[PDB]
């Protein structure tokens, strides 16, 4: 196998075969050398299919003696070298979020790691926009469940700024619901006025009246917006 | 004079909505 790497004859699947061979015989640390000796030889569209192997074996196989900073290095080396070549990455940014949450327990860090995965600067926000929506939704789910009012209001006040207006519709609703559940409904009503965006998610802002003259004024304001 | 002319160019529903909310709350 080594004189088939030296001749540059390996294929990606044959490299993963070498890795699985060495892992099955409990020479696990040698397999990481095989992922390192082969990942530089293939273009970015193949590397992402070898990295998902290398990070999973490193982070989960029980014979890996990799210190918490060593795996935390791998996930940064992958995420820089893939994202600089515009590959979609949510299977790495989620795995990093899980690993960081599991080992350090610093949930704010893992939330930030997802946030980094939403705000990737390589390509325009309309590129890979299915994944880059899922990451935001995961991030804010963690934030609301675990961290509480502080970081939620700083994630929401970033997410709505950068996603395209046609995709922001569920975030304003969920944000206003969260703020209303906190209380002091004028703060919620700011976002409920912010719902004037385009497209029929504004009906949720009308249905949010459960949070009478003020309601009539709301009806008037929405009616004006209906012909803007 | 048509040019001169053309240049010049909810409470019940609220109560009904309140009634609907009350009916739903029961």
């Amino acid at each position: 196998y080594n004189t088939v790497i030296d001749l540059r004859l390996i294929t990606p699947a044959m490299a993963e075969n070498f890795a699985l061979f060495l892992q099955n015989h409990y020479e696990v640390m040698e397999s990481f050398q095989v992922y390192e000796k082969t990942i530089p030889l293939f273009p970015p569209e193949i590397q992402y299919e070898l990295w998902i192997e290398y990070l999973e074996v490193a982070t989960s196989h029980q014979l890996s003696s990799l210190s918490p900073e060593h795996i935390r290095f791998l996930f940064e080396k992958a995420l820089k070298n893939l994202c600089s070549n515009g590959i979609d990455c949510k299977t790495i940014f989620i795995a990093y979020s899980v690993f960081e949450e599991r080992i350090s327990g610093l949930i704010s860090k893992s939330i930030e790691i997802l946030r980094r995965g939403a705000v990737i600067g390589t390509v325009s926000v309309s590129t890979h926009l299915e994944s880059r929506l899922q990451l935001w939704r995961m991030c804010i789910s963690k934030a609301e469940s675990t961290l509480g009012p502080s970081v939620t209001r700083e994630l929401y006040q970033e997410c709505i700024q950068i996603l395209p207006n046609s995709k922001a519709v569920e975030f304003v609703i969920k944000f206003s619901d969260f703020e209303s559940s906190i209380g002091e409904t004028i703060r919620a009503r700011e976002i409920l006025a912010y719902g004037a965006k385009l497209t029929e998610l504004w009906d949720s802002f009308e249905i949010f009246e459960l949070k009478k003259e003020t309601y009539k004024d709301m009806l008037k304001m929405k009616k004006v917006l209906e012909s803007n | 004079q048509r040019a001169e002319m053309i240049n010049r160019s909810x409470x019940x529903x609220x109560x009904x909505x309140x009634x609907x909310x009350x009916x739903x709350x029961x």
Binding site: E16, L20, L50, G105, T146 | -
Partner: protein, 55 residues
């Protein structure tokens, strides 16, 4: 993962040959807590010590 199960299925295909061959800060609280509880129990042990001296 993509390449792994290709490798696994090919590992099954090898057996043919193998045959033929024969709450804002809760996150930080949760991390400090196992040390804080040890200090708590050490404090209470010393409390019982000074109580045993007082009697």
């Amino acid at each position: 993962p993509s390449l792994r199960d290709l490798s696994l299925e090919r590992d099954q295909e090898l057996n043919q040959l193998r045959a033929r061959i024969n709450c804002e800060t809760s996150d930080l609280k949760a991390k400090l807590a196992p040390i804080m509880e040890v200090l708590e129990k050490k404090t209470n042990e010393k409390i019982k010590g000074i109580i045993r001296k007082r009697v």
